[PDB]
Amino acid sequence: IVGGYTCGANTVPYQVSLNSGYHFCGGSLINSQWVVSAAHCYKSGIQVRLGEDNINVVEGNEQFISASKSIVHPSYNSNTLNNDIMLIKLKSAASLNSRVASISLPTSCASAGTQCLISGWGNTKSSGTSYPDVLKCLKAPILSDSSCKSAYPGQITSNMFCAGYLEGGKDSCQGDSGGPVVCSGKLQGIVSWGSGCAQKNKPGVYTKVCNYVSWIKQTIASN
Ligand SMILES: Cc1[nH]c2ccccc2c1CCN
Numbered sequence: 156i157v158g159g160y161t162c163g164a165n166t167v168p169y170q171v172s173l174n175s176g177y178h179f180c181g182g183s184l185i186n187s188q189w190v191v192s193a194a195h196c197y198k199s200g201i202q203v204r205l206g207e208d209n210i211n212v213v214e215g216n217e218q219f220i221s222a223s224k225s226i227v228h229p230s231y232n233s234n235t236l237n238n239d240i241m242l243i244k245l246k247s248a249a250s251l252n253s254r255v256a257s258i259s260l261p262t263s264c265a266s267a268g269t270q271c272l273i274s275g276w277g278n279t280k281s282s283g284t285s286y287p288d289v290l291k292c293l294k295a296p297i298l299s300d301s302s303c304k305s306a307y308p309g310q311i312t313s314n315m316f317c318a319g320y321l322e323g324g325k326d327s328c329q330g331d332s333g334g335p336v337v338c339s340g341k342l343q344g345i346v347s348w349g350s351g352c353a354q355k356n357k358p359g360v361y362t363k364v365c366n367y368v369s370w371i372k373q374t375i376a377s378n
């Protein structure tokens with residue numbers, strides 16, 4: 156997260172870190188046994204880390220649970236990043252409390268102008284690299300579809316939205332991949348892609364979760 160603020164320990168209780176020997180992506184806990192992330196985060200041998208603040212120190216609220224199955228969306232296209240969503244089932248159910256909690260799926264799509272919270276452990280610099288150990292947060296609005304398509308001609312599908320600031324300076328970044336965009340207490344987006352981080356006229360692009368609720372629910376019900 157570039158241009159954000161330190162969230163505070165366990166103030167984003169649905170945020171997960173995906174670990175394969177190191178943090179490589181975020182995700183969101185949607186019930187006691189399932190996490191949603193980006194399809195571009197797929198790999199084998201994922202350990203899901205819940206209750207994290209500092210990802211390099213054991214602080215006492217963590218739960219570490221291996222993934223038993225990953226399901227990339229059937230229509231994910233890695234060249235265009237259309238349908239950039241994946242589900243991960245945990246080997247055992249997490250213990251839910253005030254600091255480890257699920258985030259609700261949306262019943263409707265959020266409109267442009269809605270303020271959202273984006274969080275992650277990604278790079279905090281637009282040029283160069285500095286990775287934080289504690290979770291960072293950013294409040295940002297959903298942008299109109301017209302402004303989004305004007306920023307990325309020919310690249311925005313109906314399964315994507317832009318959020319952030321056309322002036323630059325505040326954005327998600329590398330390592331925030333797969334993390335949550337929460338608006339009005341519901342999961343509306345997944346950190347997906349962009350042109351660099353925090354550049355002028357290049358807001359972040361996010362998977363539009365409201366288009367996937369039926370697939371998520373049907374998949375969880377049968378797996
Ligand atoms: C999700 C993601 N991952 C990256 C890696 C390098 C540069 C930009 C990005 C972005 C977009 C940030 N808004």
Ligand SMILES: [Ca+2]
Nearest residue numbers: 209212213214
């Ligand atoms: Ca920790």
